[PDB]
Amino acid sequence: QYPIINFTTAGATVQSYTNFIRAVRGRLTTGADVRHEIPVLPNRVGLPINQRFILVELSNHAELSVTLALDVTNAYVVGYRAGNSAYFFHPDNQEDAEAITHLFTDVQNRYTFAFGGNYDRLEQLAGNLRENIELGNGPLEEAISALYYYSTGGTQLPTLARSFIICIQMISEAARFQYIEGEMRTRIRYNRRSAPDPSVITLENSWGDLSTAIQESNQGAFASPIQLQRRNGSKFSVYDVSILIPIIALMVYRCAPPPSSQF
Amino acid sequence: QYPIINFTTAGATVQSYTNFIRAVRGRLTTGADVRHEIPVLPNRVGLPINQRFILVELSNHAELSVTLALDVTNAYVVGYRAGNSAYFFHPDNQEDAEAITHLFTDVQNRYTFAFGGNYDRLEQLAGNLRENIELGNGPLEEAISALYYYSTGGTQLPTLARSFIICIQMISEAARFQYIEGEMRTRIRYNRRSAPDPSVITLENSWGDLSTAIQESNQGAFASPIQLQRRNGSKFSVYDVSILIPIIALMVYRCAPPPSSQF
């Protein structure tokens, strides 16, 4: 009964991927809460368990499916189901451990990993940094197969971690950032697989801080600039929400919006 | 041959005044130059004399007309014609003194005042501050008559200065600020005459600094906040262009726009 959105790599096009990311955004946030034109995900505080997650069912040309569970409070992958097994990243706290008991409740085999789904950890297990892991439709198709076969011994842990890294950036980070969505659409459009450049990496790294800075800004103006990088690795300073309007699609809830206080 | 826009106080309504201010804005600025969604008047540097001014012909229920000349670089009144006499505020420099020779060129009687048309001066000559001078359709109708009769000895200097103060705020400041336009539309709508409150006064006082601050901002964010007042006189700090989008309609050109430099 949590909302499901389907996507397939089989015959994927810029348009089918765009439709899919737009649907994911529409199930992640209502639109109750927009700050500077940028939507905010639901506040976890007081959020009912029936509204906590959404499910992304991914299929591939190999005719395999897996279902990722995303937390609506941060857009992040918390676990997945393949067939009669489900696996959850190690929960941050007791409330998160209880919440995940409400996902994939008829699966006969439920496992919680000892490790978290954060990039520092997954890259360590993968033996590769995000900057050395190709993204694109071929990587995603392959990642789906890897997650699918984990339960029967076909996927080694590094491969599994690599495959998480792929799914999280092509789904969760693309939902968070129109800019990352745009980078994935380009890879699909021109059949390219390629590792994310520093523009993608720094946006991923900065998403929580950008969320805070926008929400705590004085009328849009950041108290402290955030340094990002361009595609060539050069510095780009962000001083204001205005420059992020085309870039960021959704933010983690960080504070109550201050009163309208228009002139 | 400079563009003329007509307005009458006779039977004025919110709609006829709105039409009139929209027309004045459309002849003041092209739209070549918009910074944060807020239009900029033409740069005076290199501006051809044939594009320098516009003319506002004001008529009243008494069947009197005067024509104000506005400089397009700052929206300000530089002089007026009534019948066979024209009067110009004291020019700031030699380029401005030459420019005004191109206005009302067939008038038989041309005079330049020794005093400028700035508020500090006009209030001194009027013997009243803006905060003690009623604005509204009755004040404007009266101001038109006062300017009209100046040449024949019917208008004393304080009355003349008061009448300038009226015209400049109801025309030039309303063209500059949708907020001041809105305050004048309210006075027309409810037949009220009343002196401008601190929200109006501080916006007038700050127009040049707001223009600079927006144009020199870092992506919208002011280096230094500008303090305005609300209608009750309380402080309102402005940190960012975003809060001024509904308030300010046009700005004096202060600098070249920096490169787009989008992410």
**Residue of A72, A144, A66, A143 whose CA lies nearest to A102:** A72
Q: Is B111 a catalytic residue?
A: no
3-state secondary structure chain A: CCCEEEEECCCCCHHHHHHHHHHHHHHHCCCCCEECCEEECCCCCCCCHHHCEEEEEEECCCCCEEEEEEECCCCCEEEEEECCEEEECCCCCHHHHHHHHHCCCCCCEEEECCCCCCHHHHHHHHCCCHHHCCECHHHHHHHHHHHHHHHHCCCCHHHHHHHHHHHHHHHHHHHHCHHHHHHHHHHHHCCCCECCCHHHHHHHHHHHHHHHHHHCCECCEEEEEEEEECCCCCEEEEEEHHHHCCCCCCECCCCCCCCCCCC
What CATH architecture does domain B1-175 belong to?
3-Layer(aba) Sandwich (3.40)
Report CA Rg, chain B.
18
Span(s) in chain B for CATH 3.40.420.10: 1-175
Nearest by CB to A221, from B220, B228, B244: name it. Answer: B220
User: Quick check: A36 and B262 CB within 8 A?
Assistant: no
Out of B25, B27, B173, B183, the active site residue is B173
CA–CA gap between residue B140 and residue B123 (Å, rounded): 17
Q: Is B130 a catalytic residue?
A: no
According to DSSP, the residues that pair with B194 across neighbouring strands are B135
**Would the annotation count A192 as a binding residue?**
yes
Chain A residues in contact with B221 by the CB 8 A cut-off are: 220-222, 239-240
Query: Please, which residues have CB within 8 angstroms of residue A181's CB and are 6 or more apart in sequence?
Result: A18, A21, A174, A175, A249
Q: Is B173 a catalytic residue?
A: yes
Determine the straight-line distance between the first and last CA of chain A, rounded to whole angstroms.
Answer: 45
Span(s) in chain B for CATH 4.10.470.10: 176-263
Say if CB B57 and CB B67 are below 8 A apart: yes
**Residue of A54, A64, A57 whose CA lies nearest to A155:** A64
Determine the 3-state secondary structure of B63 from DSSP. coil
Q: What are the tokens at A140?
A: 């995603």
User: Quick check: B263 and A247 CB within 8 A?
Assistant: yes
Annotated binding-site residues of B for AMP read 76-77, 117-119
User: Quick check: A263 and B236 CB within 8 A?
Assistant: yes
Say if CB B103 and CB B2 are below 8 A apart: yes
CA–CA gap between residue B176 and residue B73 (Å, rounded): 12
CA–CA gap between residue A34 and residue A248 (Å, rounded): 12
Checking A105-111 for CB contacts under 8 A at 24+ apart, the result is A107/A81, A108/A84, A109/A84, A109/A85, A109/A151, A110/A85, A110/A86, A111/A85, A111/A86, A111/A87
Structure solved via = X-ray
Length of chain B: 263
Rounded alpha-carbon distances, angstroms, from residue B241 to A45, A218, B85, B237, B238: 33, 11, 42, 12, 8
Which of A203, A226, A240 would best serve as a mutation to test chain B binding (most B beta carbons within 10 A)?
A: A240
The conformation of residue B135, written as its DSSP 8-state character, comes to B
What is the residue whose two structure tokens read 């916006």? B203
Angstroms from B220 CA to nearest CA on chain A: 6
Angstroms from B142 CA to nearest CA on chain A: 31
Out of A17, A80, A87, A119, the active site residue is A119
Say if CB B100 and CB B78 are below 8 A apart: yes
CA–CA gap between residue A110 and residue A85 (Å, rounded): 6
**Residue of B221, B252, B159, B188 whose CA lies nearest to B18:** B188
Query: Please, which residues have CB within 8 angstroms of residue A50's CB and are 6 or more apart in sequence?
Result: A1, A2
**Residue of B188, B189, B169 whose CA lies nearest to B180:** B169
Say if CB B88 and CB B100 are below 8 A apart: yes
Q: What is the resolution of this structure in A?
A: 1.9
Nearest by CB to A242, from B220, B222, B236: name it. Answer: B220
Q: Does domain A176-263 have CATH number 1.20.1530.20?
A: no
